[PDB]
């Protein structure tokens, strides 16, 4: 997710009747022509087209090649100038919305702590920190939500929440 | 054992998405720029990242360069202040950070003296010197902290400080 949206690009103003394979061939050819590939082979793994709203997403094999492809904004395909942008959920600062959850009762397991977090929406990452010697929870965890706009809702809802004997600390892990 | 883990360091708070090669290149460059390298060639042989828990272990070519690199604690790498620590099973040789505590009131018992010391962190060794025949205190003690980093904090917090009519002396016992 955090690097997932870091490997896709929005493409607007696509030619009528274009196929996903044709778009893929075009962008791979352009990457090779521009000397923008960081390895042999094909930087674009997949494309998904919405015919009716005339846009597509490209999926790249690497974060650096995705960034390189931003240079193609305005490129001509079948006589039309393509609009190239980041996905709206692109994170320019990776990990900016990772949360630290502290003050967890030390008997709670992964699933139980997740059940607390997922009241606000699905998670893309979670881990509960445990003492590797004993397997015992150290009483803190980290997570990231699928929808990064839920992060501040979750902090507002959970930070300072009394959880039996303990008071939660929920903040950006930073 | 006593001589284990002498050429590795824990690095926490690493940049989200960072590669092992990028971390390696960064530390090797810093060793060079910072004047901590002690011979031609790369001091860092390898970096092993745990992506789920956001830490790395650096593997060094030498014992002395590992020690040197501890000075990088807190260095900012791609926006993140790195946490640099010894491996948990690394231990200095016994008595390396033994402390002498002088100027104690002689009516205070072992546990009462220990209380002042344990406020800084747990002890792995302690003894209050007493007259064997009578069992009464000679007003000085020795100790060693579990965490060797605590040693300088105890010295800073207690050395030269007023305790009753006496000024405390807290110093490394050799």
From Swiss-Prot, chains A, B:
Where 5-hydroxylysine occurs, the residues are 114
Query: Where in the sequence is Phosphoserine found?
Result: 132
Q: Where is the RRM domain?
A: 7-89, 97-174
Cellular location(s): Nucleus
Top-rank taxon of the source lineage equals: Eukaryota
Q: How does it assemble?
A: Interacts with U2AF1L4. Heterodimer with U2AF1. Binds unphosphorylated SF1. Interacts with SCAF11 and SNW1. Interacts with ZRSR2/U2AF1-RS2. Interacts with RBM17. Interacts with PRPF19; the interaction is direct. Interacts with POLR2A (via the C-terminal domain); recruits PRPF19 and the Prp19 complex to the pre-mRNA. Interacts with KHDC4 (Isoform 2). Interacts with ZRSR2. Interacts with the SF3B complex composed of SF3B1, SF3B2, SF3B3, SF3B4, SF3B5, SF3B6 and PHF5A.
- Its family? Belongs to the splicing factor SR family.
Q: Which disease is it linked to?
A: Developmental delay, dysmorphic facies, and brain anomalies: An autosomal dominant disorder characterized by global developmental delay with intellectual disability and speech delay, epilepsy, hypotonia, short stature, microcephaly, intermittent exotropia, and non-specific facial dysmorphism. Brain imaging shows a thin corpus callosum and/or delayed myelination.
The record's function comment reads: Plays a role in pre-mRNA splicing and 3'-end processing. By recruiting PRPF19 and the PRP19C/Prp19 complex/NTC/Nineteen complex to the RNA polymerase II C-terminal domain (CTD), and thereby pre-mRNA, may couple transcription to splicing. Induces cardiac troponin-T (TNNT2) pre-mRNA exon inclusion in muscle. Regulates the TNNT2 exon 5 inclusion through competition with MBNL1. Binds preferentially to a single-stranded structure within the polypyrimidine tract of TNNT2 intron 4 during spliceosome assembly.
Q: Which protein is depicted?
A: Splicing factor U2AF 65 kDa subunit
